[PDB]
Paper text:
In the PPi-(Mg2+)3-bound form, a trinuclear magnesium cluster is coordinated in an octahedral manner by the conserved amino acid residues in the Asp-rich and NSE motifs, PPi group and water molecules. In the opposite side of the active site, Mg2+B is coordinated by six oxygen atoms of NSE triad (Asn256, Ser260 and Glu264), PPi group, and one water molecule. The hydrogen bonds between coordinated water molecules and Glu192, Ser214, and Asp257 were also observed in the PPi-(Mg2+)3-bound form of VenA. Upon coordination with the trinuclear magnesium cluster, Asp115 and NSE motif stretch towards the active site and lead to the movement of C and H helices, which reduces the volume of substrate binding cavity. Besides the amino acid residues in metal-binding motifs, Arg344 and Tyr108 in the active site of PPi-(Mg2+)3-bound VenA rotate by a wide margin compared with those in apo form. Meanwhile, the guanidine group of Arg344 is rotated towards the PPi group, thereby forming a hydrogen bond. The results clearly indicated that only the first Asp115 is required for VenA’s activity; supporting this, Asp120 was found to be located outside of the active site and far from the PPi group (9.4 Å), Mg2+A (7.9 Å) and Mg2+C (9.1 Å).
Diterpene synthase VenA is responsible for assembling venezuelaene A with a unique 5-5-6-7 tetracyclic skeleton from geranylgeranyl pyrophosphate. VenA also demonstrates substrate promiscuity by accepting geranyl pyrophosphate and farnesyl pyrophosphate as alternative substrates. A promiscuous DTS VenA containing an atypical 115DSFVSD120 motif was characterized to catalyze the unique cyclization of geranylgeranyl pyrophosphate (GGPP, C20), giving rise to 1. The monomer of VenA holds a typical isoprenoid synthase α-fold comprised of twelve core α-helices and four additional short α-helices.
Author numbering:
A (entry chain B): 32 to 120, 152 to 373
B (entry chain A): 32 to 375
């Protein structure tokens, strides 16, 4: 292919920066050095990771949260992103997971601490299944990909950390299934935006678990036609997320402030995530610096990329 | 000597980030692309400039300002930093008097198109005109005239540094601080501090109310910049830094120079606080506009130090700030950060 067009995406949902996002990014960088430095082969490898500005992802997901909780969340995402990067490449990571657990557990119910360990297990089980899929060089069909990505994208910790940020416990509502539709469309929107923006990286790293590879290699589509398909698919799941949300709100439990708070959380999680995914050198290449552009022509293979108004 | 130790600095003054700092930095990068991309030799050398994160300096200095004014100041600082980097670069300028002066005249002309009625022919002139129309809108006629003097001051400053480099003549400390009041853009910093705080201190300034406040605050700002920018000025053979004055004029080894200037940062920081507290206890100290201006200077002084620990401009391209502020700094490494111990 060489160069494709990413069109304007709907961007219907609030996308806000925590008032302390820039400072939180730096302190998170601080935490990654103290806790995770020895995970990298060199200072060169650590700085490659820190230049992805993954520290600002957290505060872009919870712009509403108390600074302490925003910082806790920012460090969690750097932590799981380090693991996520080695997937694609106490104990070693144990001391880091313990610092996070000690910091986050203090502002969680007992049932939420159980859900966080389960959510991490789900992520790792997702990751493990991606490793086998990649070693065997077998790309799954669309739905199978999405099934693996519910675990691998870390939907359960995305949902739980939303609660943690909003200072609610939706454990009872979850078991009951109040957010089943909301989560289906919300997580699938999150995943497909990510698939679209992380394609340069996953293409380069031969990662298998992405709907761009499924559309290209298993459905045999041209890149532009796959990009146009998933872009339309993002609009679907985003509009249905809004519909399913508006239904919980209009419905029986929708007057509750805890439900309203959690759903406003997901709103900012979905819009904030996309803002980050345009920002990060992780997707646009080491050396890239975001200029604020959000659509246009971009290179699949160039070491660094950005949206231009012509090929 | 391949490294030095930077002790903890007092950091008594507030260092706040604008609640929109990250987004403003990005929008500032967008403005540098739109306006200045063709001032760089290539996309790669434009990215080298943007990786310095100069776009977050503005929001770290006026964290209390309305978003639009913060954005204007952010774009301003990226623009002057592009200019500072161009005219301190002998490759871009020339390595001999004749050539340096020709290229410098061109820059002076281009930047004077800034407040003119006609469209600018130059990239620098068009960037200056955009910033002029944006900032001057929110200024009094007196502030606008002061903005003209302040650019004139900056350029007189840069020209004395350029001459100094060419003639291989390091100034004595007081000459260095005289030059740097101009070359550091102090008149701009004070004016923009007024604009951010939405006040007009034209009379007060002329009357001399802030003479001690400005003398001590600007000296702290310049000294802290000389310390954090030495890594890069050493490599670039710049002469207008107190680190080079103490080493070459006064005969001091690097570590003694560094220790002396850290003590001087503390002297001028406390002197700033005393001079400021005096105005606040004086007959103008009750005025809301004076209170806002002096809080604006507090945040300029604290904010600037935070930025100078953050920027890859000083710690090397590829560097990423981890929040550390004290320890051992390599002069030779391609990327530097503060460490607990010297290289064995
Ligand atoms: Mg991945
Ligand atoms: Mg993954
Ligand atoms: Mg991805
Ligand atoms: Mg200069
Ligand atoms: Mg300079
Ligand atoms: Mg300097």
């Amino acid at each position: 292919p060489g160069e494709f067009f990413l069109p304007p995406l709907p961007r219907l949902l609030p996308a806000g920066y925590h008032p302390d996002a820039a400072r939180i990014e730096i302190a998170s960088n601080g935490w990654v050095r103290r806790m995770l430095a020895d995970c990298f082969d060199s200072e060169e490898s650590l700085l490659f990771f820190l230049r992805q500005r993954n520290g600002i992802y957290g505060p872009l997901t919870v712009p509403y949260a108390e600074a302490d909780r925003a910082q806790n969340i920012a460090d969690w995402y750097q932590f799981v992103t380090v693991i996520d990067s080695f997937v694609s490449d106490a104990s070693l990571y144990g001391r880091a997971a313990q610092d996070l657990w000690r910091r986050i557990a203090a502002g969680m119910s007992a049932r939420q601490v159980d859900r966080l360990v389960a959510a991490l297990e789900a992520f790792l089980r997702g990751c493990a299944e991606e490793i086998r899929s990649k070693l065997d060089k077998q790309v799954p069909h669309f739905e199978a990909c999405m099934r693996v990505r519910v675990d691998s994208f870390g939907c359960e910790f995305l949902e739980l950390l939303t609660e943690y940020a909003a200072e609610v416990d939706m454990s009872r509502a979850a078991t009951e299934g109040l957010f089943d539709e909301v989560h289906h469309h919300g997580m699938r929107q999150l995943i497909l935006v990510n698939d679209l923006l992380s394609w340069r990286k996953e293409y380069a790293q031969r990662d298998t678990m992405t709907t761009v590879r499924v559309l290209c290699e298993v459905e045999g589509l041209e890149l532009q036609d796959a990009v146009d398909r998933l872009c339309a698919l993002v609009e679907h799941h985003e509009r249905a997320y809004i519909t399913a949300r508006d239904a919980v709100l209009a419905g029986p439990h929708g007057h509750r402030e805890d439900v309203r708070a959690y759903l406003s959380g997901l709103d900012h999680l979905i819009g904030g995530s996309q803002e980050f995914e345009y920002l990060t050198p992780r997707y646009f290449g080491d050396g890239s610096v975001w200029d604020g552009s959000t659509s246009g022509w971009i290179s699949l293979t160039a070491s660094v990329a950005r949206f231009r108004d012509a090929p």
